[PDB]
Amino acid sequence: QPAHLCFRSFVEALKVDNDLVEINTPIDPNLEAAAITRRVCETNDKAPLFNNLIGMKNGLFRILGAPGSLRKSSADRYGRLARHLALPPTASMREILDKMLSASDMPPIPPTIVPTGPCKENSLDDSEFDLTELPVPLIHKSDGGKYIQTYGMHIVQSPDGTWTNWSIARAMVHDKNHLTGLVIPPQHIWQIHQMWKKEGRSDVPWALAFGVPPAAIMASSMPIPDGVTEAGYVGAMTGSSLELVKCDTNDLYVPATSEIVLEGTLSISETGPEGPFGEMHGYIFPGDTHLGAKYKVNRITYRNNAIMPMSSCGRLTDETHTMIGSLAAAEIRKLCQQNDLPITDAFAPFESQVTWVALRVDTEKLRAMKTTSEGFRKRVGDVVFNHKAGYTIHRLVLVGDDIDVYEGKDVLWAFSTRCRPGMDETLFEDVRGFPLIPYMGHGNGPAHRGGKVVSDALMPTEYTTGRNWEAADFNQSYPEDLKQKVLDNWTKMGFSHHHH
């Protein structure tokens, strides 16, 4: 099976790429696996495959860390993401995001049901498993639980059957047969949960599949529109219908090659302690436990020699940056364009801890709009910050066509030099805020409202007659023939490879 369609094949691909370290000696799921993975992520090293996890029994489980993190070289920096999508390992972030947006003006390709798959190789009923006995990692030393779920896909379906959502939301072990996790607005797992609560008749049928097709985990991490079934979006993106098998204890369908599947229910009534967790912004607040959603597990099925993916998230750079930020930015770009805004590109700079999105403006279009900064900032901010795709993003930085928004140095240069604090910004206090940012949920104001800003780093003439500067840099401050001479004579004079 191709790597983008099968997690086991994906692991092989990382090995073949020389992007994998297999660790065959015993590794403790209590902090050690996650510490190694954390160091990987902070250094852009090879992904760790823990083949000999202390506490593994009867095939549950090995761990792959850092599935969507960065490689060291510039040339294949995003190669791990490219391997989720059948793209060349040298693919640019623009190409990755375009691939992830491509299904948005395609017909869905619904999934295909097949009678069995590797995810049925082994099973454990409700008398045979105990979640507290599995080698579930403690990821950060102050976490409030063992976070089994950092890179699996929750599957829930609307009561009427018409929308099946796939998404990543964290969850931790509560007891032998339950998890607790975050289920918060405006996320689709929350929106579906609310539909079941209002019906009031039963708990939500649920499954959690780990080690799913890589292209599916990418869509699981992306804020595609309300009501859109991820399976059919992934089918259209990949050009192939995904093969799914029915759960044994409910009528949900899971990817046939899933490594591990939990089947059960998400309660419409019960809660339990959840968190704290070392989160995407780089912090944990020890002792900050709050009530979260509660899941009951009735059945586990799994592949022979099952592998659990894990994100050891926190400070730069991991899946919470590469996937959450970039995929939100992609959806924002599209949303802006659909609202007739002249946005060509969007990216969440890593330097901002993916709390900013830089929006590249087609300034020729802007000029034809015959508008002003105040008006344009307000329009952009209303579109983005009133939409779910803007949820996680607290600052939008508008930049003109000279800036490559995928290069954080250039975004920071433009922000710092072209946006006058205050005057060139519009604050938004009456929009939904992202409570997980420390200055929100642990800050001075409402955790759930406001704290957003549009920062205009467009210069005045970009609205009127066109750019009126040149950069004071090697590229723009010297003629072509001179630059080329300098470059040709560089090593000859005494001064100091792309791939590496």
Ligand X SMILES: O=C(O)/C=C/c1c(F)c(F)c(F)c(F)c1F
Interstrand relation of 20-23 and 47-50 (parallel, antiparallel or unpaired): parallel
Q: What is the distance between the alpha carbons of residues 455 and 373, in angstroms, rounded to a whole number?
A: 10
3-class SS of residue 178: strand
List, in order, residues 6 or more apart from 75 with CB less than 8 Å away.
Answer: 90, 498, 499
- Judged by beta carbon, residue 70 or residue 457, the one nearer K ion is 457
**Phi/psi of residue 38, nearest 5 degrees:** -60, -45
Whose CA is closest to 379, among 361, 403, 391?
361
Q: By CB under 5 A, tell whether 322 contacts Mn ion.
A: no
Contact 424, 456 (CB under 8 A): yes
Can you read off the two tokens belonging to residue 487?
Answer: 């470059």
Q: By CB under 6 A, tell whether 320 contacts ligand X.
A: yes
List, in order, residues 6 or more apart from 142 with CB less than 8 Å away.
Answer: 276, 278, 284, 286, 287
Stretches 17-25, 92-100, 157-165, 181-189: which one binds ligand X (CB under 6 A)? 181-189
Can you read off the two tokens belonging to residue 433?
Answer: 């805020």
Q: How far is the CB of 292 from ligand X (least distance, A)?
A: 10
190 is in an annotated binding site: no
**Phi/psi of residue 329, nearest 5 degrees:** -60, -40
Question: Which residues, numbered 386-415, are part of the site for its own copies (CB under 8 A)?
Answer: 394-395, 409, 412-413
Residue type, 247: C
116: DSSP letter: -
**Helices 326-338 + 93-101 axis angle, to 10:** 60
> Can you say whether residue 227 is alpha, beta or left, with left for phi > 0 and alpha for psi between -120 and 50 degrees?
left
Picked from K ion, Mn ion, ligand 4LU, none, the partner binding residue 424 (CB below 5 to 8 A depending on kind) is K ion
From 243, 259, 279, 462, the catalytic residue: 279
Q: How far is the CB of 188 from K ion (least distance, A)?
A: 6
> Can you say whether residue 353 is alpha, beta or left, with left for phi > 0 and alpha for psi between -120 and 50 degrees?
left
377 is in an annotated binding site: no
Helix intervals (H) in 202-257: 214-220, 230-238
Q: By CB under 6 A, tell whether 165 contacts ligand 4LU.
A: yes
Stretches 32-40, 56-64, 84-92, 272-280: which one binds ligand X (CB under 6 A)? 272-280
Q: By CB under 6 A, tell whether 311 contacts ligand 4LU.
A: yes
Q: By CB under 6 A, tell whether 187 contacts ligand X.
A: yes
Picked from its own copies, Mn ion, ligand X, none, the partner binding residue 165 (CB below 5 to 8 A depending on kind) is Mn ion
Picked from ligand 4LU, ligand X, its own copies, none, the partner binding residue 221 (CB below 5 to 8 A depending on kind) is ligand 4LU
Active site residue 279: yes
Q: What is the distance between the alpha carbons of residues 360 and 443, in angstroms, rounded to a whole number?
A: 30
165 is in an annotated binding site: yes
Picked from ligand X, K ion, its own copies, none, the partner binding residue 170 (CB below 5 to 8 A depending on kind) is ligand X
Q: By CB under 6 A, tell whether 279 contacts ligand X.
A: yes
Binding-site member from 169, 172, 268, 398 for ligand 4LU (CB under 6 A): 169
Picked from ligand X, ligand 4LU, Mn ion, none, the partner binding residue 323 (CB below 5 to 8 A depending on kind) is ligand 4LU
Q: How many CB atoms lie within 10 A of CB 184?
A: 17
Which residue in the block uniquely carries the two structure tokens 């499954």? Answer: 207
Question: Which residues, numbered 131-170, are part of the site for Mn ion (CB under 5 A)?
Answer: 165
Picked from Mn ion, ligand X, K ion, none, the partner binding residue 233 (CB below 5 to 8 A depending on kind) is none
- Judged by beta carbon, residue 133 or residue 351, the one nearer its own copies is 351
Pattern 445-464, K ion, x by CB under 5 A = -----------x--------
Identify whether 61 is preceded by a cis peptide bond (ω within 30 of 0). yes
Site residues (CB under 6 A) for ligand 4LU?
Answer: 150-151, 165, 167-170, 182, 184, 187-189, 221-223, 311, 313, 319-320, 323-324
Site residues (CB under 5 A) for K ion?
Answer: 167, 220, 419, 424, 456
Site residues (CB under 6 A) for ligand X?
Answer: 170, 182, 184, 187, 277, 279-280, 313, 320, 324, 391-392, 436
Q: Which residues are annotated as a binding site for prenylated FMN?
A: 165-170, 187-188, 230, 388
